[PDB]
Symmetry: none
Subunit: 245 residues, 2 copies
């Protein structure tokens, strides 16, 4: 896991305003969730050929589909993979009021066929410490279907610092609980990440899942952090679900 | 960035005389600067959907238009984008007497629509080192400046080695300032670059803007280097302007 076939190119543009375009295929765990209207409504991460992680607040059913190996939603060439979902596991301590514990697992009804452009991310340990001030990446198709346009829909990337939960409370107050982590307020928005999409950090040379898009600034400001689901807090649940199903 | 959908073909003819025609689409960041009335006066590069980099001595105003996705200027059958300019940001350390610090940013009033033939060049870090003798690529319509040759109006390319500035002063003397870079004099011209246009090298398999066509020979010369603006010396100001505007 965590070691793409096509390496990402990150430039200095990835640190500022709305980030930058990714290199096609360079984030191969990146998935789209589509409904039956064909509408992209959330992101997610393959953690193997059978299993996808997403946010609970994404509300996935077994009538949704997982899309792998997209770059441009507006494209027709792209050899993508459209996968059916066998079973949706929502974390039982999910509070839709507080958006805490914001994680769902999806077991696919058909296995993903891993290639150069489709592969897994790595899951952290419950013990892993990702310090404040560590620069980590978020990707997705977040920035559009938005306002005063539409325009082509190509996978964007941004480089953003981890905060402490003490420093994050200065923007969100009591909304922040221990099963969350914040990133950003750095001069770049986090709104490229889709809800349920990745926040990844590189740990022993491997890109690893540290966060899952939960919510952000109501106006996508480059001065207010995004709020993620703290995977390292959720991972004993993920491990139990996997061992049992 | 730096990774074209339509892969450039560079043969030996890019290495002599005045270079060769490019494959259409294959240098997707390349733009043309025109005035109100449609005179092509300068070149530029897209760095994203909102921003173009060009030369300060180009004297761009918000009347001028930016044309993207062009190959043959003589064709009305090309699906090109003509883009309007919002503001123009010259570098204030631009010395109109030595032509040093020769760079301008244009912010577009109307965003570029990225496609198979329109997309962005990468920018270097301020610490990037690009060695002498590294072979890099300059493209443009500069041959059309030769009014009574009238000339081929298709995009050209040439492959030309970088020089050290020590070695460049054997040609141009004390005109050569630290915020400059020279390339060529090995048997192929540099005159195909339009003023403002790109000099690109590949870093980690991505095409990266190392130079901006600043000055040199008034005629196409195979044995004199061309002189460019050194993007790595300028790249801090760029990030800074973008971050704020």
């Amino acid at each position: 896991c965590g070691v793409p076939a096509i390496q990402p190119v990150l430039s200095g543009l990835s640190r500022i305003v709305n980030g930058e375009e990714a290199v096609p295929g360079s984030w191969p765990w990146q998935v789209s969730l589509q409904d039956k209207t064909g509408f992209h409504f959330c992101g997610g991460s393959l953690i193997n050929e059978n299993w996808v992680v997403t946010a609970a607040h994404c509300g996935v059913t077994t009538s949704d589909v997982v899309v792998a190996g997209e770059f441009d939603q507006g494209s027709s060439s792209e050899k993508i993979q459209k996968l059916k979902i066998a079973k949706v596991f929502k974390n039982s301590k999910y509070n839709s009021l507080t958006i805490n514990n914001d994680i769902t697992l999806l077991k696919l009804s058909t296995a993903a066929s891993f290639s150069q452009t489709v592969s897994a991310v790595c899951l952290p340990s419950a013990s892993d410490d990702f310090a404040a001030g560590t620069t980590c990446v978020t990707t997705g198709w977040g920035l559009t279907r938005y306002t005063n346009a539409n325009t082509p829909d190509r996978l964007q990337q941004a480089s953003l610092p981890l905060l402490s939960n003490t420093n994050c409370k200065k923007y969100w107050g009591t909304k922040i609980k221990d099963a969350m982590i914040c990133a950003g307020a750095s001069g770049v928005s986090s709104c490229m990440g889709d809800s349920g999409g990745p926040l990844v950090c590189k740990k022993n040379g491997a890109w690893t899942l540290v966060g899952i898009v939960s919510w952000g600034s109501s106006t996508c400001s480059t001065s207010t952090p995004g709020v993620y689901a703290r995977v390292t807090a959720l991972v004993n649940w993920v491990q139990q679900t996997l061992a049992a199903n």
